[PDB]
Amino acid sequence: ASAYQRFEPRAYLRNNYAPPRGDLCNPNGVGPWKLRCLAQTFATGEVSGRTLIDIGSGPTVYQLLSACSHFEDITMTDFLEVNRQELGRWLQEEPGAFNWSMYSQHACLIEGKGECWQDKERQLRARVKRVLPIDVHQPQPLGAGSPAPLPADALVSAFCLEAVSPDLASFQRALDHITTLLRPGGHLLLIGALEESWYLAGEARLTVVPVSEEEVREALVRSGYKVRDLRTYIMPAHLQTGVDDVKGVFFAWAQKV
């Protein structure tokens, strides 16, 4: 809550999206694994629609690279102004923006349609219509008079809920809150840390609720989802680096029903 007030976006990016965790060359790393889950999922042609919302985007865009070719209206979100500012720096190709081009290139590699990475970034930048504040603790996380088209055909969320929740029930309630944004029959792609209890973002020291795969699954069910897919990536030693205590990463593909 107040902890997120010290949250340094550049320190978070550095910690998680620069070497070693950001080395995309080795297929056995977490970056490649995440992009694979995303790419494979959309390549099924079963997650489709006009509008999409990314929950708790932070200062990162990688989580939409494969998504952006299946949704013409994309909304990004975060609780922090500084994170929203950092996104704009990349959306507007402004000065000092974070360099996502390695991830773009890899999404292009993985998707295998021979797309160049610049075309990919262009499409993402074009389809992102708005960056909005959000609080998942609020039963109406986007507030009242939201410019975002509701309900969304699909949701994506990476490393948010467990990271903003003191315990299971809060995680459960947060999942309930975002779920109200999703149209019935719609899809949620959810990615997150497994059995993590803290991580660092510069001066900020954030508390995390350690969750298991089974816990994640049960929560989705409780929230009204059929779980179509749930995979775990176990975190190799070399990617365990003092910035946190994550044990694995989960990917869930859930369908509101």
Place this chain on the structure above:
Amino acid sequence: PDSAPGQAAVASAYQRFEPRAYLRNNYAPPRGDLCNPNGVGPWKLRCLAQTFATGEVSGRTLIDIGSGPTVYQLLSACSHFEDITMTDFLEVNRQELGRWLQEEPGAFNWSMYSQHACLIEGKGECWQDKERQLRARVKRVLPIDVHQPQPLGAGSPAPLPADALVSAFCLEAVSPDLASFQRALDHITTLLRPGGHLLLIGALEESWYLAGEARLTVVPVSEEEVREALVRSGYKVRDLRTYIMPAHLQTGVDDVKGVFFAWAQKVG
């Protein structure tokens, strides 16, 4: 007739060849735009990748003939040969490769071409690994003159004879006429082992191009002239494809009408 004079004009004219200007003219946009799949860059990379993907072109050693200051022509090749020789007539080109080999920032940036080859080869290789492997496999950069019967000189370093040759936009760009072109092909063919493969890329119906102050003379050749010379030199032609240069890529840096790609195997 007499070979010496034409060859002499050629040598003379290349003394003004400016590598950076050439790089800019041909490998920066619009020609360097790899995003449009209908462009010449992606066509060239595709010819090479697809050819190497047959698994049919392999061995220990490969020689690139008239590399100039470019490396794109070896990106797909380099997973198939442990020993690669690069070559050029001009020291300033060889220096240019020097800069890239040393991975200096001053170097021309080939990373879009590296990524694009990774993209179409379809193995999910990252571009940094592709580049690191090319840099490792290039064992030497040698002077070369294709008008000499021994284009590498006598008692050359190169492992001869090579298992394969690559050559891009060299032969036609340094030959005053068809008979000169044919002889240059004969000369480099002495470096290839029998049963070896030659991958040849070049300009079709071009008579000139610019490389700075350098406005250089090229023999215009047709696809059929290229086919006959390969046969004349003892190759079976396995593949010969033509790219027609789109109007928007016809930028006044040359009068090229198209580009040819040939896969030929030396008889024996």
